[PDB]
RNA sequence: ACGGAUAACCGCUGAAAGCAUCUAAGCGGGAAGCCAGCCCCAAGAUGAGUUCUCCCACUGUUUAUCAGGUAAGACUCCCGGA
RNA sequence: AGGUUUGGCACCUCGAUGUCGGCUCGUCGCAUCCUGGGGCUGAAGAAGGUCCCAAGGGUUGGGCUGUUCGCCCAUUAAAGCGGCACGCGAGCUGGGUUCAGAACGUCGUGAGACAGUUCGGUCUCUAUCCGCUACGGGCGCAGGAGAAUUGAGGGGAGUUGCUCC
RNA sequence: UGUCUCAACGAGGGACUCGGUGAAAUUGAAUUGGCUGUAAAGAUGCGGCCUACCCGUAGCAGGACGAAAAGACCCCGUGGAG
């Protein structure tokens, strides 16, 4: 059920790599540590910032582009036209934490 | 996402109105609605988020 | 309510009391009962008679087993009346009485696909003054995008006859029960030779 | 990511009518049958239940509507159709009203109408899907 | 129009749900009830009355009260109006169970009354309607009433016996 | 024709409004009109209905996995047809 | 109120939306000509007046005129009013007005003109889709066959006189 | 005297079926329904609601503002010609 919810993910999925919006952390060295606003970690879960006072560490994997896509815009009877390229890079994180 | 919270709200007795605030209420859990879904594939914790929302909310 | 079924032989010139009368002769030979419709069983009540004998080296095995439960000998028509509960077998002996009036039921002579003023009496347009619409040809069909379709329903170039068809309250000339002819008044539908049934009359008169 | 259940599940219910409003009875039945209760996971999939509605012809309208509701249908003929039927002509075929009230709050598209073979109405207290043992269900939800 | 009902010697009432059956000498009946209102004790005289001071409810306190009241009237009494022939040649005629009109119009006129209802003739030129309901009275005396209304220019027609009619000047 | 519910309308019972009132609860009467009744079509009513009868459990190894000889029964073809 | 008249306005259509009348074929409204039911009448009867309900069906044949109208003849229960591109020309006429000829009256010096009047004057063999009338092929309708059938629903029909009791 | 009430029957030549040869105008593309409403003001194609299994053949002409000719009327051009 991990999740990498909007930019910083809380939920308990051990040990598997996952993509991520970036880091800055180079290679493995981000080693990121973890926030926490619900996991089932061992059945037992909870949220009321008692999942705060948990934290899941994630060694970085690799940086990586995204698939490429074409923004495509066009109106009706005005000309315009518009063909543009675009991919986003991410950060993929392996999980580990507690 | 929506559609199935408060499925599952309404399985306990609230809705997603009463349950999405009173969560909102409880130390502001800020779980998205795509989590609190999952944790309607996964029964007994998102009964527990209900009792929770239910609590902030008396 | 009362029923049978025959064949249509024709049409003659008669007398009663110095009217001439025209009758239709028809043979309303005698009738099986081939099955009973119960409603608790079928769901309603009704009879199924059947007519015009066939030999057996030409009814194939399905329904020569239907005749078989019943004890008959095969037909080559059945049919079903309803509400009739008769005994033994229908014959047109005293099922119909001189001087009734009964509904005779047909299928019309088949006249192929005639055109609108043989079939619906268009009356189409004239034969001089210039046309090239002089013969049948329908007018207009419609009003100007105003719907813009045709109408449902329409009166159209079609087939015509080969119907079915009822003919209410023609009245009951002559029995010869022993020849099994019965002798009715006035015209009924379809040409001879054909099937034709006979019915107590349905609209009955007050 | 989300999930997408598959659906071995067959939901039988047993709704009774007598006395409840019938366009409120409607919504409960069209609501149930349309997915909606349970997380609804796909709107791709029929997942929702099987409907067995007794007792049609008991079914309440409150205010004027029994003989104000005229159910209107129209035949292809341009000759007049628009034939109309009072809804105390109900007693013509009471489920046709139960069917028309959910029909209306249902889908209308290709998988709507598959929806409305999920639902069987029978104006009397008895029904023959005994080999389901629907559920009950009651017939409105508390706050 | 409200006021507290008479119970005469021979009669008997229950207060069940809007249910009313009243057993007097001529035989039970039973008067429909609103439920909203409670029906009243039976001890002795009965009356029942509105919640409210409010504007729907008289209505009914005074159509409730007249209607359990004529209905004892009823059981208790029996009812029975008079009918009067009148015109030339008008007259009446018993059948069976049944009225036998005859009135001015090429076909005789028959009326079969309604259960518990008993037509009667002494004189030829009038009626009598006995009977229980009051309401099922009413309805039978009305029909032979509209067998033939007194008409304005001559006063031809059925009438109540006491029935002054004005009539129309006719040349 | 008969019948059911109705229109204008005509009434019974009847309060509000101690009288009256066809209406505010309730009930009856009432048209070439409405529904049904008459004739014709109709289960592609994919919600595909019901009943009577008929024929019956054939054959081929992991290779051809579904097809093939047949039953009951049709069809092609021939001679004709209100 | 309606939107059927004459109009205002100029919004789609000037790389075309054929216009009067007739014929043919229909169908709708109802503010009802007839029939059906009612109230009132200065309604005795009869014959009516007028208003309310009612759109099932019905609503004639000729003379004159291109006519629509309208007048007339002879009937009628009645001889209804309107919508549908003032319904309907890839359905017909082409009498009418909007081409070329020619004439009268009038206007213009003229060429020519018209509010006009008059005789004459090319109306385009092949339906793609939709809509309609008829008729088949396919598949479906949890085995393959032959017959008999309930009727959800749908269509047709629906006028009226006269006389006698 | 079939022009007509009022149309009938019959003939031949087409139209229909089979074998041979085989065009045309037109065509934004099409998986091309009804009502009502809305839209540049007359909707298959937008909205709501109804109806509707797939595919043909013979036929009718209401729609596709159907086809044909960049309206001959009307106005405009500091256009043309008799
Ligand atoms: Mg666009
Ligand atoms: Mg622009
Ligand atoms: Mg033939
Ligand atoms: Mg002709
Ligand atoms: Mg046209
Ligand atoms: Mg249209
Ligand atoms: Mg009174
Ligand atoms: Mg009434
Ligand atoms: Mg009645
Ligand atoms: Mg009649
Ligand atoms: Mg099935
Ligand atoms: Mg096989
Ligand atoms: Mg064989
Ligand atoms: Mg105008
Ligand atoms: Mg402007
Ligand atoms: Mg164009
Ligand atoms: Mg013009
Ligand atoms: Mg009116
Ligand atoms: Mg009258
Ligand atoms: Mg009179
Ligand atoms: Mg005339
Ligand atoms: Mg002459
Ligand atoms: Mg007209
Ligand atoms: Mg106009
Ligand atoms: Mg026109
Ligand atoms: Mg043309
Ligand atoms: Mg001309
Ligand atoms: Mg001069
Ligand atoms: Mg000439
Ligand atoms: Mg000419
Ligand atoms: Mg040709
Ligand atoms: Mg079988
Ligand atoms: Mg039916
Ligand atoms: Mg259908
Ligand atoms: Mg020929
Ligand atoms: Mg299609
Ligand atoms: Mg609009
Ligand atoms: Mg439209
Ligand atoms: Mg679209
Ligand atoms: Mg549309
Ligand atoms: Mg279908
Ligand atoms: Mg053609
Ligand atoms: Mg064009
Ligand atoms: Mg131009
Ligand atoms: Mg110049």
New binding site residues.
Partial sequence: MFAIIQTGGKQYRVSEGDVIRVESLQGEAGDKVELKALFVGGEQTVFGEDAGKYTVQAEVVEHGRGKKIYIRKYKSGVQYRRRTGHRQNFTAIKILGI | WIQRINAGARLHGMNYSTFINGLKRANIDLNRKVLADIAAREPEAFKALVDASRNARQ | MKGILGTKIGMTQIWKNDRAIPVTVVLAGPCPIV?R?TAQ????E?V?IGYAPKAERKV???????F???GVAPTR??????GFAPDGDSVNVDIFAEGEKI?A?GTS??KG?Q???????????????????WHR???????????????????????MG?????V?NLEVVEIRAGENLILVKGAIP?????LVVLRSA??AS? | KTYIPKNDEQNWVVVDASGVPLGRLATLIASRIRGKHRPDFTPNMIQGDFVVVINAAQVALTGKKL?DKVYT?????????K????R??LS??P??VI??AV??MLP?GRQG?AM??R???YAGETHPHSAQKPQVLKTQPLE | ???PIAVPSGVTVNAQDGVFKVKGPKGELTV?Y?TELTVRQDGDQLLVERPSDA??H??????T???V??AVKGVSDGYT?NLELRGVGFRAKLTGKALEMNIGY?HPVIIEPPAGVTFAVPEPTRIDVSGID??????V???V??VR?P????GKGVRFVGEQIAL????
Avoid: C
């Fill in positions: 099955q419709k069983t079928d769901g309603y009704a199924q194939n095995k399905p329904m020569q087993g239907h078989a439960k019943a028509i059945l049919r079903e009346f309803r509904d039921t002579k088949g696909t055109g609108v003023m043989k079939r619906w009496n268009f009356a189409g347009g004239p034969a001089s003054h210039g046309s090239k619409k040809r329908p007018g207009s069909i419609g009003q100007r995008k105003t719907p813009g379709r045709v109408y449902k329903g329409k009166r159209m170039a079609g087939h080969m119907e079915r068809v009822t209410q379809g040409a001879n030779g054909g349905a609209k007050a | 003989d249908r129209y035949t292809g003929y341009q000759g007049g159709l034939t109309e039927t009072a105390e002509a013509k075929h489920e046709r069917e028309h029909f209306g209308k109408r409305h073979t639902l069987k109405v | 129009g409200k006021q429909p609103n504007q729907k008289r209505a009914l306190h005074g159509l009260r007249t209607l009241a004529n109006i090429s009051k309401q099922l009275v009413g309805q005396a009305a029909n009433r509209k209304k008409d304005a220019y001559h129309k000047a006719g040349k």
